[PDB]
């Protein structure tokens, strides 16, 4: 007993000593109005706000459904075709078209070209894990959301495949954190949110 | 060595920062507390700050914010501009 | 195990008992003290040069008991053990070992010269000795075998590594891994294993000298996680991230002392 | 006020106590024993061993012999008691058979005395107090003898004709050492306690009293000089200062000092704490602290 | 036994590989050379006796900028004024921007200064053997750095309005500096396999 009774006598002081160390070397840093963290002298230490660009305090570990999935079942979740399929037409309600003229058939394979360039990379970057902390719980904004409006399977979607795809493109390009353009300065931004992005094409793909 | 920046080509974020809100409300507080021209129908308050907050909500409060860049240049923002 | 025992100090660790000094006049002197002797006689009988450009010189016989306690755990023959000695001392020593059929496995190491030029800077009068003990220091410290100078004993533990499949799924490829016990690397990937694309260490000091500077940042991040996570620990990738960039943001590794 | 115990050393050991490995030495033999006769206790010992620098030389052992000055190989001291001839010296350390291993280590030890080589030089290599003095031999010899009768193992006996007794102890000391480098036992444990002693209100009020009387005999001694000169008459209670320890204990017991308000600055804090009469229970737990 | 021979085959996975990377031109044939395919092009008595003319050249694709680099071994151990200043005329004869000379082990101070002195715009780099004979570039922990034209250099100092000093430095003695052959002042963009969220780009200069 008298061991964890002195090992508690230490953590009472030492712990404090080590604390001041860090502070006395990090007071220097802070986030400049440019969207970058810099030294006293201006010597810059990060080009984001923490590589992410976001405030730690507003974040919720999240999950990538689209990762630990078998290619075989991947296709059974996102991919769509006219090959002995056309099962969605049972949901297109109200209003099918039907199929109208090209365009649609084409949007459907273009969405997956990018939802697919995301399945391969990652990985090629992330080991195997899936749970990672992103800003804004998306898995929740949809529930509750199916509380606010409800509507069950019985009610098919008054939407349109040509909308949800525009929906994003217009509201991912609203998620800017590095301003602005200022061409090429739009690059630091395109991939300073690239991770958060593959989420929005995985939980809102057609 | 300043440089000043174009009220037309502003870079920084259109939204008002965690810290700024805190500084503005701090600033008008002192102002009004110092008998000053209050810019919104007095709701019937007493607290030189709880009043300033009545102002902020209606974005009817003076004061602007000069945001110094690393360069040495700056930007000026209007409380009514900000978000 | 090919590698397990292919990257260890090794050197003269099998002897540890040891070094004996016997004075034997004629090149055909012995005694014992055991058996042997016979083997020595057989080596001389083959008179394939006994005389040699020189003759019979080497009144400083020295013996070596190689423990079969480390002869099994590390694939070592007796013709190798004393097969690389004379690859760093010219011909100043003549080794004569025996087959594995022996019960003690011993190896001799004589010294010949005279009539040598002798000299210089520093005389030696009384008495053929010191110069000896000194030689031992180098012998026992050099050095054949995949002994990565400095690299002490190693270990092997199954590390549950996660891999991918052509399927999609991921699997837990329980592969083996060695756990060093001290510096250093560099001559450590030169090995046949090994593996260069993945070898790791605990001395950033060195990782900066032998990988990248960017590399060494990742090293910190990882080495700090392993400090405050096991177990159940308040981690934020952000603040950890920042400490690292501050350390490796001006090139050299800026320490954070009191 | 309540005096409070203390736990320093033990003395009279007989204590391995090693270290490593900055490193400089390798294997010590502290003794710090000293009478003990009823107060005094100033003195130490310690002796080295070394075993580094694979280039220098063969692992050789030395000694210190307080309070001056440097390192002094062992054979040098046996040759300074009454045992100069070799062999006999080893008899005090080890006992053949033997067991050359434990002895061998001597080789390097003896070599240090390959110049001694009798009794003259021995006492000679001892001129280093000090504050610059001597001149030179004869004097040096005298100092050596004094040391052997007060410094060199001050307990045992401080008489004159007893140098054959201190001849074995050293052998005994270094007997222990050898047992550890050869790895034949284990370095004594400083944890005791079992070996440390508590200095109650007795041995404490000893070292003080003594440290105030020896000034008596000094302050008065000076008075005699002034009397014999110009004065005389003889003596009488004319001197014997009254305010010498009377006031010289008040502010030495009252505080944690041991000779105030003299210069004695850093003189270990008391040990003198006020009573602490919060609860009866407490009072008692105070008259039993160290 | 012939261990010190095979051990150099890897000096062509640490060399012809060291190109692009940079931007020079090397044949995808000289990058997929197996253990024996190496002994093939090189005809040595044995068995052993190797050496010969181990060391060739190469051309770039970046068109202008100039000029060209020369890979050249030794293979003479310990070097060495009797192999240095004497192997520069060659470097001035075919005209090259710069080249490499390797060694093992150690190099004398004398033959280190009496060179990079009249070299002028050219350069002597840098490596040796029993050291960087395995491309570190290929390492979980080592992100790929890519060079920055002087034009692109001026970009950063605008978009981020900085000074050539206010950036993340890199010591010369860095195996990745030496590798790409950074000189004091150039600026190297690196794309970090960060998280981060994303693929965060960092930048660094030299010192």
Swiss-Prot record, chain A:
DNA-dependent RNA polymerase catalyzes the transcription of DNA into RNA using the four ribonucleoside triphosphates as substrates. Largest and catalytic component of RNA polymerase II which synthesizes mRNA precursors and many functional non-coding RNAs. Forms the polymerase active center together with the second largest subunit. Pol II is the central component of the basal RNA polymerase II transcription machinery. It is composed of mobile elements that move relative to each other. It is found in: Nucleus. Belongs to the RNA polymerase beta' chain family. It comes from the Eukaryota. The tandem 7 residues repeats in the C-terminal domain (CTD) can be highly phosphorylated. The phosphorylation activates Pol II. Phosphorylation occurs mainly at residues 'Ser-2' and 'Ser-5' of the heptapeptide repeat. The phosphorylation state is believed to result from the balanced action of site-specific CTD kinases and phosphatase, and a 'CTD code' that specifies the position of Pol II within the transcription cycle has been proposed. Coiled coil: none annotated. This is DNA-directed RNA polymerase II subunit rpb1. Component of the RNA polymerase II (Pol II) complex consisting of 12 subunits. It comes from Schizosaccharomyces pombe (strain 972 / ATCC 24843).
UniProtKB/Swiss-Prot annotation, chain B:
It comes from Schizosaccharomyces pombe (strain 972 / ATCC 24843) (Fission yeast). Disulfide bonds: none annotated. It comes from the Eukaryota. Belongs to the archaeal Rpo6/eukaryotic RPB6 RNA polymerase subunit family. One of its GO terms (cellular component) is RNA polymerase I complex. The gene is rpb6. DNA-dependent RNA polymerases catalyze the transcription of DNA into RNA using the four ribonucleoside triphosphates as substrates. Common component of RNA polymerases I, II and III which synthesize ribosomal RNA precursors, mRNA precursors and many functional non-coding RNAs, and small RNAs, such as 5S rRNA and tRNAs, respectively. Pol II is the central component of the basal RNA polymerase II transcription machinery. Pols are composed of mobile elements that move relative to each other. The chain holds residues 60 to 142 of 142 of the full protein. This is DNA-directed RNA polymerases I, II, and III subunit RPABC2. Phosphorylated. GO terms for biological process: DNA-templated transcription elongation; transcription by RNA polymerase I; transcription by RNA polymerase II; transcription elongation by RNA polymerase I; tRNA transcription by RNA polymerase III. One of its GO terms (molecular function) is DNA-directed RNA polymerase activity. Signal peptide: none annotated. Its main location: nucleus.
From Swiss-Prot, chain C:
There is a cross-link at residue 118 (Glycyl lysine isopeptide (Lys-Gly) (interchain with G-Cter in ubiquitin)). It is found in: Nucleus. It comes from the Eukaryota. The tandem 7 residues repeats in the C-terminal domain (CTD) can be highly phosphorylated. The phosphorylation activates Pol II. Phosphorylation occurs mainly at residues 'Ser-2' and 'Ser-5' of the heptapeptide repeat. The phosphorylation state is believed to result from the balanced action of site-specific CTD kinases and phosphatase, and a 'CTD code' that specifies the position of Pol II within the transcription cycle has been proposed. Following transcription stress, the elongating form of RNA polymerase II (RNA pol IIo) is polyubiquitinated via 'Lys-63'-linkages on Lys-118 at DNA damage sites without leading to degradation: ubiquitination promotes RNA pol IIo backtracking to allow access by the transcription-coupled nucleotide excision repair (TC-NER) machinery. Component of the RNA polymerase II (Pol II) complex consisting of 12 subunits. The C-terminal domain (CTD) serves as a platform for assembly of factors that regulate transcription initiation, elongation, termination and mRNA processing. Belongs to the RNA polymerase beta' chain family. This is DNA-directed RNA polymerase II subunit rpb1. It comes from Schizosaccharomyces pombe (strain 972 / ATCC 24843). The lineage of its organism: Eukaryota, Fungi, Dikarya, Ascomycota, Taphrinomycotina. The gene is rpb1.
Curated annotation (Swiss-Prot), chain E:
Gene3D superfamilies: RNA polymerase, Rpb5, N-terminal domain, RPB5-like RNA polymerase subunit. Transmembrane segments: none annotated. The modification Phosphoserine is found at residue 149. It is found in: Nucleus. InterPro entries: Arch_Rpo5/euc_Rpb5 (IPR014381), RNA_pol_Rpb5_N (IPR005571), RNA_pol_Rpb5_N_sf (IPR036710), RNA_pol_subH/Rpb5_C (IPR000783), RNA_pol_subH/Rpb5_CS (IPR020608), RPB5-like_sf (IPR035913). The lineage of its organism: Eukaryota, Fungi, Dikarya, Ascomycota, Taphrinomycotina. GO terms for molecular function: DNA binding; DNA-directed RNA polymerase activity. The keyword Signal does not apply. Belongs to the archaeal Rpo5/eukaryotic RPB5 RNA polymerase subunit family. One of its GO terms (biological process) is transcription by RNA polymerase I. NCBIfam families: PRK09570.1 (NF007129). One of its GO terms (cellular component) is RNA polymerase II, holoenzyme. DNA-dependent RNA polymerase catalyzes the transcription of DNA into RNA using the four ribonucleoside triphosphates as substrates. Common component of RNA polymerases I, II and III which synthesize ribosomal RNA precursors, mRNA precursors and many functional non-coding RNAs, and small RNAs, such as 5S rRNA and tRNAs, respectively. Pol II is the central component of the basal RNA polymerase II transcription machinery. Pols are composed of mobile elements that move relative to each other. It comes from Schizosaccharomyces pombe (strain 972 / ATCC 24843). This is DNA-directed RNA polymerases I, II, and III subunit RPABC1. Pfam families: RNA_pol_Rpb5_C (PF01191), RNA_pol_Rpb5_N (PF03871).
